[PDB]
Amino acid sequence: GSHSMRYFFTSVSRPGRGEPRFIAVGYVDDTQFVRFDSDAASQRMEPRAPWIEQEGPEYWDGETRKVKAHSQTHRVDLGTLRGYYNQSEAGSHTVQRMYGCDVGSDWRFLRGYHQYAYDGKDYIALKEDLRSWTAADMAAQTTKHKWEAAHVAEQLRAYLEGTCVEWLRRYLENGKETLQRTDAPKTHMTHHAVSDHEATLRCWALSFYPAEITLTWQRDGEDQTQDTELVETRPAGDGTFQKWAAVVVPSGQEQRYTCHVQHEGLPKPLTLRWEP
Amino acid sequence: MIQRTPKIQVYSRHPAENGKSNFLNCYVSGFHPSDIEVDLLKNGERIEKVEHSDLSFSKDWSFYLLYYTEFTPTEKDEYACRVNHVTLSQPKIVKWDRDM
Amino acid sequence: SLFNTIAVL
């Protein structure tokens, strides 16, 4: 299928004392593989998947140097932004950045992105052409004009189209045993008497990867939305995901209802029915 | 300065069986800003050995974190997650239901 | 692998 490499960066200013807290994490698809935390003792980029551990010392050195450079850029930006928004030095503020690349099922470049937020709202983003920027407000507009004049996008474009893809492909192959494996949902149904006249059926999808999944209930072969509940997809902690969906039904009518499960790991969708 | 209140789920990693070791999860998501206090509780008391995931965020810039601990469920022990955040006028407690 | 040089605002 398609794949992506994405890096996420957060920097939170600390007005009482010291420098901004900075946290960076890197993902391939739904798998975290590296982290940096400015408050950790190591002051190094750290592995978070086994397959990255085979990278040699020059890798770790270079990623550490780069991530620390990123932390400084975010520090400077927090200053610039407090000035653009005419904010006092007293409050804590946040910058967030995400960049990366997607490839298609042929592992060739599909799209690149580079987005920035301030205090949890869009600030500036690279357009899909990778040559110009979209600014959300008049402060970001000043950034857009500066970056366009300076051709900030051209080295970034070359990274997103070239370097990013080359690394993503390297990781996919070195991480093959997990990154190229789908884990189909392990499914089951539970039944819970609510009263003498109504029951809850809960359809479970467990231990799947990647996280994208669809669970739908049908009654006599038509989609049912009322009297249902769905939870957000949640991490199990072991790199896989969980979800459930439930429906409330008249006792004795359980067999009318089917739960339908769609996932990349399933060549055909699964249908579950309470007929135990 | 947008603020968003956290969603909370409390659940086990594996189907819970009394006397079998497991992991108790508190998943907090949808929140902004990122400073958040999360404790897992056994019969009301704060559990000491709790780890958490590295801070990341969703497509709408809101933050998510997994807090977890090893535990061994029993018939009578109650577990919960307690969360405090600038958006809450008091800490929110969600009890673990083994069927959810 | 990270990008080598992110520019400031």
Please spell the DSSP secondary structure of A181-244, one letter per residue: --BPPEEEEEEEE-SSSEEEEEEEEEEEBSS--EEEEEETTEEE-TTEEEPPPEE-SSS-EEEE
Q: Of the candidates A10, A142, A20, which has an alpha carbon nearest to the alpha carbon of residue A91? A: A20
Q: Domains of chain B: which residue ranges?
A: 1-100
Contact between A132 and A143 under an 8 Å Cβ cutoff? The reply is: no
**Tokens 């490839």, residue located:** A103
How many Å apart are CA A2 and CA A168, to the nearest integer? 11
SS (H, E, C) chain B: CCCECCEEEEEECCCCCCCCCEEEEEEEEEEECCCCEEEEEECCEECCCCEECCCEECCCCCEEEEEEEEECCCCCCCEEEEEECCCCCCCEEEECCCCC
Contacts of A18 (CB under 8 A, 6+ apart): none
B1-100 falls under which CATH superfamily? Immunoglobulins (2.60.40.10)
Phi, psi of A178 (to 5 degrees): -110, -50
Give the experimental resolution in Å.
1.7
Q: Which amino acid is at A190?
A: T
Q: In the CATH hierarchy, which top-level class contains the domain A1-181?
A: alpha beta
How many Å apart are CA A209 and CA A230, to the nearest integer? 18
Q: Is C7 helix (H, G, I), strand (E, B) or coil?
A: coil
Contacts of A201 (CB under 8 A, 6+ apart): A189, A190, A191, A246, A247, A249, A254, A257, A259, A274
Q: Domains of chain A: which residue ranges?
A: 1-181, 182-270
Q: Residues, chain B, total?
A: 100
Fold of domain A182-270: Immunoglobulin-like (2.60.40)
DSSP state of A46: E
Residue A30 burial (10 A CB sphere; 0-12, 13-18, 19+): middle
Q: Which residues of B touch A234 (CB under 8 A)?
A: 9, 11, 25, 27
Which of A23, A190, A232 lies nearest to residue B7, judging by beta carbons? A232
Which of B25, B33, B99 lies nearest to residue A94, judging by beta carbons? B33
Say whether the peptide bond before residue A210 is cis (omega within 30 degrees of 0).
Answer: yes
Neighbours of C3 (CB within 10 A): 19
Q: Which amino acid is at A23?
A: I
CB-based contact, A186 to chain B, within 8 Å: no
How many Å apart are CA A89 and CA A184, to the nearest integer? 50
Alpha helices in chain A (DSSP H): 57-84, 138-150, 152-158, 164-174, 176-179
The nearest alpha carbon in chain C to A60 belongs to: C1
